[PDB]
Amino acid sequence: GSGLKTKSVRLSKMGKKELLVSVLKNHFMVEKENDDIKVMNGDMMARISGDGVTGDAGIVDKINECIKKIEAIYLRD
């Protein structure tokens, strides 16, 4: 029998980037362009790249808040 359970099969509990997309999309209109994530709200726009964000400061501050809270959820902060 497999009573030991040395295998978990799959482990997807670090997908913070996925939740960023979902949460931002639930509050703002989000567009995917140049394989980046664009957050748009009130004609303001922001671009999230692999390791940097450039965009409207209001959106950026919100993005950062969302990222950090979500980071706290999976990685703990």
TrEMBL record:
It is found in: Nucleus. Belongs to the metallo-beta-lactamase superfamily. RNA-metabolizing metallo-beta-lactamase-like family. CPSF2/YSH1 subfamily. This is Endoribonuclease YSH1. The chain holds residues 569 to 643 of 643 of the full protein.
